């Protein structure tokens, strides 16, 4: 179960927190009104975080502390809503029987028990806040039968704990107050219990063959990948609109629209034209690049292979209703010998084509597309980038 | 005013001579001499009014006794030509050389042999009447009251006398002469408004609210006094103008008072009345709308209680429009505190019921708290507050009602008046109680913050609570700094605020919406044995509950018991593994 | 015979020593290292209502296709983000879609065992699903498709452990592959128009490549630590790498027949759920489970970024063919267009 | 000075101090008195009866008369024909003018002179030197001549009357000279004098200076001493003016104005009170030792020590009201009363409430009522101190029953309704115990507490009654017995019912 590991890590945290030799010291304050022992101030825990965790931002360490304290690992002695506030207020750890890691789950009758007990310990005031008084009103109206032993065991517990010493009753009641704060919190702050429903739950011959495919699994050195990754970063590094934007106009930040609108304009910018020059794949991604490359191929009387590859791609878009209607037709137009558009195949290519053409398939012309595609990538794109039209358009 | 009525027959520049100095009065005169108003004087010319009067009186009577023993002397050769003339002249001259009131005089006898002696400047102008006729008719100084001179026009003198006895010769003694002198009492200050004296009365000062003040100035004339009016402004004759109210010390008979609006207060009252009426009619509504969804969720009588109580809490602001007195501030505190508890208190306790029904219901629906329970934990509070009011109300009504203190009482802004009710430490403690009470309510509406409940009443209630606490703190703090800077208006603003605010609020919020070791081995074994003991204890309690949980069916109990036993034995055998 | 078999294996070891004398990156260090990236989001899609679990570009370099786990396929325009289609599948867990070259039809299916295809165009304004014409159908859930460049023949993979080509209108099977024993999950055309070949690997921890001209399992490899979840060709037509839920991505040659270099990092631990290259062939892409993405150098082996965009997990990932960008599939219920 | 100046005239001090017939009816004088210093500083008719003014008036009249008459030109010295008759009639009218001008002479020589003295009704007169005529002192002067009081004697017994004289020297007539001397003498013996006057005839108030001193003198009788009565101002009177024994006027005696004490009684009272509080503390320690068998659980150690701290908080009022009433006393009294009250009886009744629920959260009921009582002390305390410590009312009062006085802490309507609190907060528990009538345990604890409650209601009601009834006619001893008695009764009782059984 996932969150179990999370709670385990934070358990590591608090275990290092109340360390014998290091740790925060749980002090005993003396006041003009009273003498309160076994507390400490939130500035202490803030300092402890910053020391032993090296959390550079005070705010960051404070937010870590915030959610920790909203998972019941320490609470403010005079408040319902768990929030760590860096100041002189008094805190306390929680008990190993009342962590939240212990799969606990209170229920409505037990909330009624704690309500009767708190309301009946003191009888000097309605020692409570308006939300908890509201909850008790509902519990009354709906629990008409079962009240009595609730009251019974409540005052029983009151005697069984008051019989022990006066500071004991105080600390135990403080703890077993806060632990019900965290498991039924004030209307505002988020519950920290819930979870998402998603987590709501020959033999050696194939073995040996896996070993052999790992052998023939061609790999390259990490330095090679390093160069590839750095270089693919660099070639658009000057295009990153987060780090160093080529144009600081940001429709988000600087309330402009012109950047995208220039992007909509079919006329390519000089960034655009320099960016075409990296790879014809990116070109074909560009509609503008498709148009200009196709123009050159036409004016050079060489506008067929691109026509084919566009044909393959535009075929790979329609549903299964038209796959046969196109495959036979595209064969008869390009891959049927005797048609004007003469795609050119070798032995195994045309063999594969002839065998598959009976059956229209989502991966029909893979090897032929590879063949013509390596052809175009090897020949066309180079001369295009080398071409006068490319140079004249990249100049301005 | 017989005097002015008497001297209303003045002859020539009389008050110009009698109220004013008689210079032009004597420079403007055409008559005979010696106008004696003898006896018209207050009393007569037979009284005692002055030191120099009694000086001359002593001179008078001692001359008289001297004569009555001297003219009765022996060896009375009567050498009226040899040297007895030296004796007589030395006598009459030296007397005014000794006496101070020395204008003119005579001694005319034959015992006319007249030493008619008048101190011209320092030489007694000596030379040789009806008064003599009267002496012959009748011993005593025949003195008149104020008589003028004889300038051959009235007389160029003010007050003066005519005091005269006889040089009675001597088979007994007999009147044979007339010694006399006319001293001018024109140099004698006088008092119209006197108690006793020359025309001692009060001319035009009604002394019911006037006070004369006779004085000493120039001397013998009318106007020789000063009147005052008493406790009122002199209408200006000087005559009292008691202030607009009893604001004493009447400089100008003007007000001390910030007199205050009509077209504020009319609308205040009409408005507040309409809100009171809304409350009443809400009560009538729910009396008609006794069937619903939520009135059963929130009991009828609680709501009538609330609404009534707060209706009553609207009294502070019909109160003040009437004048402050004893009765006012007292009823204020009655109404306030009644309203306060019987609104916010019951609300808070409703919420307490919420909490308890919750647990009650979580454990065994058996109607833990009911609407029958609320009123009891209401009456407690109602009582307490009654005893308190009786305390305060007693202190007043038995000690400081009449004896020493009061409430109807005013202070001043800069120099102007304002009355009101007022405070002491009690209202302070009152406030602090309200504060704490709702504090408890707020803790309640703090913890109770999480229920699954129908209409979220908690929102509504709890916000009324918080609102009220705030508004009350502020109100009381202001009014309990501001004892001194508060006319009626500014206050009435403040009470209007507090009341419509919290009353309307905590009517509405509730009522209206109801139509809309950190280780692994150790901790591992620890949590493990914990769960284990929990299981085994659950099992033992299950064994006891076999008959104790008689609440349901047997086979159903049978199935439950069987499943529990099976899973428990499974967990045991797993713990053993 | 056993000794001779092992001796042929030792001879393969010898020839592998001669070829790999210097390691890929032991020579790769020579190329000049690479600089900084600044890529991040440039669009977003917000139409789905579930997780999204498949996506594909057109050749027109601008449109979008992606299906979901609910039942609803989509057709966007990320340049415009404006829907021009829509369609509903009868079932659940639609786990794989595909786009026509010209733009005529799309195949979506999984867990219903039957892969329908619809005519893409603006032909019938009533429905994009109403013209459902069954074309393939296995007896189990269906993992993915590759219209293999004619627009009239589509691949498919299920839990059967066996794939085949299925015509468009007919349902007429054309050839079969039964070399497996588990659930396969991967399928991609070759770039070359030389020999129309393709790969299939899966739960068995292995990968095997069919030659469609026959149907015979010519090449075969196994090094993964768990189930695998996708794979893609090196775009010169010469090799292919991958990653799974080991989180340990690897790249494999065709000419040397050997592993070339490990792609892992202890930091990332979660599952690896897609890969795809960049038009240069320089980079590497992978969506993960820890929710990031992770671009890696293909030569020098370092990371270059982590571009955190997704609240959930990465389902699957692709590069547009023009070379200008890339998208992600994720558990976050939407898509992005990562430039 | 004045005191030493009294040893002046022997056989005259009766005529001086007594102003008596011992120096007059039988005492050989053979010489007239002389006030040339026996008067004040000189009074010179600046400290004057009017009669001085009358005398000087007639004097000056006659003086001007004879002066201007002798200033008549060509002074003839014609004493032959009738001028003697003029002078004779003149002196006759002269002495006839004053009813107390006893004798008077007039000499004119620019040895023989005219004289006359009042025999009975006529001027016994003769052309011979008599009355007064001091040509010798006039030559010594070479204004009028003031003179000295006298006595009717030159070589005889001083007869009735002391003679103060007025005298003048007849200025002659174009220059002046001494040509005569005329003088009379009037009885300066029926002449009221003032020892206590601010200024008068040698006024010395040497009988009542300061010691509760007032001089309320004998105003007008005549020239007599011992005529300045003094008053003893607000104290005792035994020529003795004295203070009071205390700030307590009407001291017809210098007796005391307070109650008789019974100190010896009070010592043992207080000792026994300490006895009970000792038992309180002691038993708290007893508790905190022997805390481990049945009583510990049924009866909270805490709640016991609550009650004992109550009793120890409580017993104070006694030790208070031995001491004197200051106002700061009374307030502590209210403090201790209500605090011990609530702090005990709250825990008591709450135990029963808890019992009643067992039939069918303690301190969060108790701290409430402790709160309310805190509040109350504060409120009332401030309302008396801040606003009645000074202004209007007095709390510590010196109240009198009949002859004596006594201090005490006084009351207010407040503590009435406070007592009523006691009534009700018990009556709750009474309901409680009554209906909870049969309810078991091995203790009859409920019977014990219910007994406490009936006890305290009736009896603490009575104590508050018999204090509030007649406090205004209490001594400061009968009261103390009251406090002692009722608090020992009810509260030692209400201790013992709880504590007694929990040993045996």
Residue numbers in the entry:
A (entry chain C): 18 to 218, 256 to 450
B (entry chain A): 70 to 180, 189 to 205, 211 to 220, 261 to 292, 296 to 361, 389 to 668, 703 to 763
C (entry chain D): 15 to 353
D (entry chain B): 71 to 180, 189 to 220, 262 to 292, 296 to 360, 390 to 511, 525 to 668
Give verbatim excerpts from the published study on this entry.
GPR158, a class C orphan GPCR, functions in cognition, stress-induced mood control, and synaptic development. Among class C GPCRs, GPR158 is unique as it lacks a Venus flytrap-fold ligand-binding domain and terminates Gαi/o protein signaling through the RGS7-Gβ5 heterodimer. Here, we report the cryo-EM structures of GPR158 alone and in complex with one or two RGS7-Gβ5 heterodimers. GPR158 dimerizes through Per-Arnt-Sim-fold extracellular and transmembrane (TM) domains connected by an epidermal growth factor-like linker.
Cryo-EM analyses for GPR158 (residues 1–863)–RGS7–Gβ5 complex revealed three types of GPR158 states: apo GPR158 and the GPR158:RGS7:Gβ5 complex in a 2:1:1 ratio at an average resolution of 4.3 Å and in a 2:2:2 ratio at 4.7 Å. Since the 2GPR158–RGS7–Gβ5 and 2GPR158–2RGS7–2Gβ5 complexes exhibit virtually identical structures, except for an additional RGS7–Gβ5 heterodimer in the latter, we focus on describing the overall structure of the 2GPR158-2RGS7-2Gβ5 complex and close-up view of the 2GPR158–RGS7–Gβ5 complex. The RGS7–Gβ5 heterodimer binds to GPR158 through the DHEX domain, which is sandwiched between the ICLs and the Ha helix. The disordered ICL2 (10 residues) and the cytoplasmic tip of TM3 in apo GPR158 becomes ordered upon binding of RGS7. Conformation of the three ICLs of GPR158 bound to the RGS7 are similar to those of Gi-bound GABAB, mGluR2, and mGluR4. The DHEX domain faces the ICLs, inserting the Xα1 helix and the Xα1Xα2 loop to the inverted V-shaped TM interface. The Xα1 and Xα3 helices of the DHEX domain are packed below the GPR158 TM (ICL2, ICL3, and TM3), and the Xα3 helix is on top of the Ha helix that is positioned in perpendicular to the TM helices. However, the Xα1Xα2 loop of DHEX is shifted towards TM5 by as much as 6.8 Å, consistent with previous reports that the loop is the most flexible part of the RGS7 protein47. In all cases, RGS7–Gβ5 collides to TM domain of the other protomer. This suggests that the inverted V-shaped TM4/5 arrangement of apo GPR158 is critical for recruiting RGS7–Gβ5, and explains why apo GPR158 can facilitate noncanonical signaling. The GPR158–RGS7–Gβ5 structure provide a basis for the selectivity of GPR158 for RGS proteins: first, only RGS7 family members contain the DHEX domain, which is responsible for binding GPR158.
